Design an enzyme around this catalytic site. Structure first.
Site, PDB file in Angstrom:
ATOM      1  CG  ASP A 186      -1.670   1.264   1.497  1.00 33.99           C
ATOM      2  OD1 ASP A 186      -1.739   2.150   0.619  1.00 33.99           O
ATOM      3  OD2 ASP A 186      -2.279   1.416   2.584  1.00 33.99           O
ATOM      4  CE  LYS A 212      -2.038   7.170  -3.616  1.00 33.83           C
ATOM      5  NZ  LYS A 212      -2.340   6.072  -2.584  1.00 33.83           N
ATOM      6  CD  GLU A 261      -5.225   3.730  -2.326  1.00 40.26           C
ATOM      7  OE1 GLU A 261      -6.003   4.534  -1.722  1.00 40.26           O
ATOM      8  OE2 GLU A 261      -4.119   4.076  -2.832  1.00 40.26           O
ATOM      9  CG  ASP A 290      -9.473   4.610   2.516  1.00 42.33           C
ATOM     10  OD1 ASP A 290      -8.827   5.212   3.416  1.00 42.33           O
ATOM     11  OD2 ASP A 290      -8.947   4.037   1.549  1.00 42.33           O
TER      12      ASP A 290
HETATM   13 MG   LIG Z   1      -4.906   4.846   2.256  1.00 44.76          MG
END
Ligand SMILES: [Mg+2]
Ligand SMILES: [Cl-]
Length: 382
Positions: A8, A69, A173, A197
């Site tokens: 991840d 990111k 994800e 999330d």
């Molecule tokens: Mg995350």
């Protein structure tokens, strides 16, 4: 035959897992931590990645890089890039249309594409998996947000390649979180799954449909600028106010003092997910003055009450967008450390009229966990 791992690669933290001996092990890093800050920093003598880089951010802010990111697969002129640059202490420069972060390293100006910064994070993930397994790791599944485009996916694969990984697949994800819970190990009618999330820097709500093991992303909603850090920051301002009352000094512009306080707040928010009280314990916070204090779970909830309520707006919006009723969501999956907050779980469960939440896999690990399962499947080890 070295085993394949699931990684991840998170906005704020990264996490690596490996399926073996019938279960996923989430691997602790060289500091003993099961997640590693997605941070890199450059000094006169060395390159730091993970905890060491995060730990010196206030001492060396212009040469410490994070949120790569946010840049990966972007062009310099992108509105999101231009807006995000205003919140970062490091320089982002235009190399013939592509953004690069520019730092000083060992006395020279150096610049790195986003995927080069991320390859350093992925090299750390690789190495901490190799230290735990005692053998070379080459194969990985790497996850990305469901809303990533082709450019952003291919740049993340490139970070993998640069790190010496064979990226078996890039998977989303929320799909990884669903695989973690075995939700695709399921035949019969189409099931709607909502992934809620709330990570350290971004909030994603995804509704997936899963039918005979096949995923479709039905809708996504959230706020790419809300996350656990915002709740931390509510606490930071609260304690800056308290220190001012108790010592008539405003610490606000000492960045080293504010960062030590922020770190104590991040620890307290995790403590308040399990206990009703947490301490703030800082020797010599400012001009030699100690700061030992504490906060209740209730006061932390009060400081964040508007933001917590506001998390249900993206859930309503995902639902409208997917043309679905509350009652048509078969499974709700929690992802991100902030979904351990009792008050958030209550708000979400009351919103879903009592429906139980899938939360038994540590939510800050669940994406890596699903990636590690998929990696083993793709390798033939499961
Ligand atoms: Mg995350
Ligand atoms: Cl994160």
């Amino acid at each position: 035959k070295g085993p394949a791992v699931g990684i991840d690669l998170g906005t704020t933290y990264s996490c690596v897992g490996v399926f073996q001996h019938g279960k996923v092990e989430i691997i602790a890093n060289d500091q003993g931590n099961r997640t590693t800050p997605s941070y890199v920093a450059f000094t006169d003598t060395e390159r730091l990645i993970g905890d060491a880089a995060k730990n010196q951010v206030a001492m060396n802010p212009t040469n410490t890089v994070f949120d790569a990111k946010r840049l990966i697969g972007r062009r310099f002129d992108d509105a999101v890039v231009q807006s995000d640059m205003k919140h970062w202490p490091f320089m982002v420069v235009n190399d013939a249309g592509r953004p690069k972060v520019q730092v000083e390293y060992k006395g020279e100006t150096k610049s790195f594409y986003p995927e080069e910064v991320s390859s350093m994070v992925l090299t750390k993930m690789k190495e901490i998996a190799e230290a735990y397994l005692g053998k070379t790791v080459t194969n990985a599944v790497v996850t990305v947000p469901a809303y990533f485009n082709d450019s952003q996916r291919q740049a993340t694969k490139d970070a993998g390649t640069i790190a010496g990984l064979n990226v078996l697949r890039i998977i989303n994800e929320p799909t990884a979180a669903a695989i973690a819970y075995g939700l695709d190990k399921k035949v019969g009618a189409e099931r709607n799954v909502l992934i809620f999330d709330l990570g350290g820097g971004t909030f994603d709500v995804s509704i997936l449909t899963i039918e005979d093991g096949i995923f479709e992303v039905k809708s996504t909603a959230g706020d790419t600028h809300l996350g656990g850090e915002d709740f931390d920051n509510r606490m930071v301002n609260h304690f800056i106010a308290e220190f001012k009352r108790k010592h008539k000094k405003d610490i606000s512009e000492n960045k080293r003092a504010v960062r030590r306080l922020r770190t104590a707040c991040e620890r307290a928010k995790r403590t308040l997910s399990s206990s009703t009280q947490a301490s703030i314990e800082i020797d010599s916070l400012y001009e030699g003055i100690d700061f030992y204090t504490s906060i209740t779970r209730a006061r932390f909830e009060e400081l964040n009450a508007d933001l917590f309520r506001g998390t249900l707006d993206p859930v309503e919006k995902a639902l409208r967008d997917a043309k679905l009723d509350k009652s048509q969501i078969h499974d709700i999956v929690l992802v991100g450390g902030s979904t351990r907050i009792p008050k958030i779980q209550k708000l979400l469960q009351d919103f879903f009229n009592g429906k139980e939440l899938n939360k038994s896999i540590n939510p800050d690990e669940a994406v890596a966990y699903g990636a590690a399962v998929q990696a083993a499947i793709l390798s033939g080890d499961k």
